[PDB]
Design a protein around this nucleic acid. Structure first.
Length: 115
RNA sequence: GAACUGCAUCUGAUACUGUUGAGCUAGAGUAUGUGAGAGGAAGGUAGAAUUCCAGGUGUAGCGGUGAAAUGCGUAGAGAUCUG
């Protein structure tokens, strides 16, 4: 159906969500580290992001995407592992971009944790 | 005898303080030219980001923590794109 695609790698400190959409922005497939058997501490590792990206890529590869460009966002650890997973799954990467939301001194952040 | 460190009234001195006359420019101010600055007050505007709302795709999680759970989610969340 679609040959050009975008892989969004939304990676937080707790979880990483790998969605694969077309060039327009309509999601084709997605996977999460918390939806792959890993919970708690294991879920926020690069390996869980690797398996999530593998699952999402293998699910969206039946659609017909071979050309894909990735959009990494967030500071989580799996932001680098997911792209390697996509590259080793046979995806032809178009470009690696880091579009993470950065306010220009906007909304006040939550208070510092006293741990 | 000394002292009573005091007070009062005359006289003298004019270095310093006071009161005065004149002068001076060095302290302090004025006019004129340039300069920097998140100095102040009143309006307008821009770009990111959050939240909310309405939609398209999409499907089973999200979120959170040292772990969790409360919470949010198949009444369709989160993710993604458009207003």
């Amino acid at each position: 159906s679609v040959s050009e695609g975008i892989a969004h790698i939304h990676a937080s400190f707790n979880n990483t969500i790998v969605t694969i959409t077309d060039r327009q922005g309509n999601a084709l497939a997605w996977a999460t580290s918390g939806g792959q058997g890993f919970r708690g501490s294991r879920k926020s590792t690069p390996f869980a992001a690797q398996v999530a990206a593998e699952v999402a890529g293998k699910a969206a590869q039946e659609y017909g995407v071979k050309n894909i460009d990735v959009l990494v966002k967030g500071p989580g650890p799996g932001r680098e592992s997911a792209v390697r997973a996509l590259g080793a799954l046979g995806y032809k990467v178009n470009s690696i971009s880091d579009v993470t939301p950065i306010p220009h001194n906007g909304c006040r952040a939550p208070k510092k944790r006293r741990v």
